[PDB]
Symmetry: none
């Protein structure tokens, strides 16, 4: 009937950082999945069932 | 009837940081799933059943 | 009936940064999926079921 | 009936940065997928069921 | 009936940047995909089911 | 004088002088070298009498901003300076 | 004079002078070096009488901002300086 | 003078001079290097009489901000300095 | 003068001068080097008379801010200094 | 003068000058070296007046901030210093 929404956050990601210095890394992958970086996922769904927000670094071989 | 919502957050991720310095790393996987970068996921669903927010860094081989 | 929404955010990603200095990296993958960069995904759906927002770094060989 | 929406943001990404200095990198992949850059994806969907926002660093060989 | 929308954002990407200095890079790919650049995708769809916004950096060999 | 108003309507949105910095703003460097900034002086019931005989008299504020002053035996900034040197 | 108003409406929304810094704002360096900032002076019930005979008189404040001054035997900043040197 | 108002409304949202810093704000370095900041002086009931005979007089505040000064036998900052050296 | 108001409403949301920092704020370094900050002086009932005969007089505050001074036999900062060296 | 109010309301939310620091704030280093901060002086109904004969007089306070001073036989900071050395 009477709604006031001010500065409301729903499904929000903010303030994600990564700092590296003098860093060395080696990756040798064969048929797999390697994730080293940053993933920032924000999701807001209405009337949506079975919703996946993030799916990172999997190796799926279902039947 | 009479709702006021100010600065309300629902399903919010904030303030995620990683700091690395003089770090060496070596990854060698074969058919697997390696994750070294953390993920920030925020999810809000309305009338959504069976919702997954994060599915990071595994291996699924269901039959 | 009477709605005022001011500075409201739904499914928003903001403020994602990575800083690197004197960093070296080697990647050698064969048939795989290696992710090192930044992914920032924000999603809002209305009446959308089974919606994925991010699917980074996958290797999928389902049957 | 009476809606006022001021500076409301839905499915919005802003403020994504990457800073690198004195950084060397080597990638040698065959049949694979290597992602080292920045992907910033924002998606809003109305009455759309089963929508993917981002699919990065993928290797899919379904049958 | 009475809608006022002032400075509203839906499916908007802005403020994405990368800064590189004294950076050298080497890529040698055979039959694969390598992404090192910036992708900024903003999508807003109405009455569209099954919409993908970004499909960066993959290799798909479905049968 | 900035005024934004909305009276006697069913809906009103008023925005005064608002500033937004959305986007990418890049500055390589923003140095400032040898800068004098913001000098203010206030006096009340002002009355001045100056009598000078062979000298130098300056009334007011002094503000000197220099980046590089080269040379040996030089004077960069002087206020009320008397120099009587033999050689 | 910044004013934002919304009266006699069913729904009124008003923002005064508001600042947002959304996005990416990159600054490589923000150095300041040799800077004089914010010098204020207030004098109430003030009158001045100056009598000078062969000298130097300055009435007020002094602000000197330098970055680099090189050279042997050099004076960089001097207020009320008397120099009587043999050589 | 910053004002935001919403009167005689069913719903009113007033925002004054607000500041937001969402997003990425990167600064490589923010050095300060030889800086004089915020000097204030207030004087009430001040009458000035100056008599000078061959000297140097300065009446006020002194502020000197320098970064780099080289030189053998050099003076960087001097206030009320008298130099009488034989040679 | 910052005011945010909402009178005679059914729902009022007043927000005065508020600051938020909800992002990534990166600073590599924030050094300050040789800095004079915040000098204040208040004087009531001061009626100054100055008589100078061949000297140096300064009437006020002295603030010197330096980073680097090189040199053998050099003077970096001096207030009320008298130098009479034989050679 | 910061004011936020919501009166004659069935529902009121007033917010004064508030600060939020959510997110990631990163600082590599926050050094300060050779810094003078917060010097104050108040004088009420004091009694003084200056007469000088060939000397050096400074009236007030002194604040010197230096990071590094190098050199042999040098003087970094000197207040009321008298230097009469035969050579």
């Amino acid at each position: 009937v009477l709604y006031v929404g001010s500065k409301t956050k729903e499904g929000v990601v903010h303030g994600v950082a990564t700092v590296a210095e003098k860093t060395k890394e080696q990756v040798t992958n064969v048929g797999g999945a390697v994730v080293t970086g940053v993933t920032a996922v924000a999701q807001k769904t209405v009337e949506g069932a079975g919703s996946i927000a993030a799916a990172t670094g999997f190796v799926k071989k279902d039947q």
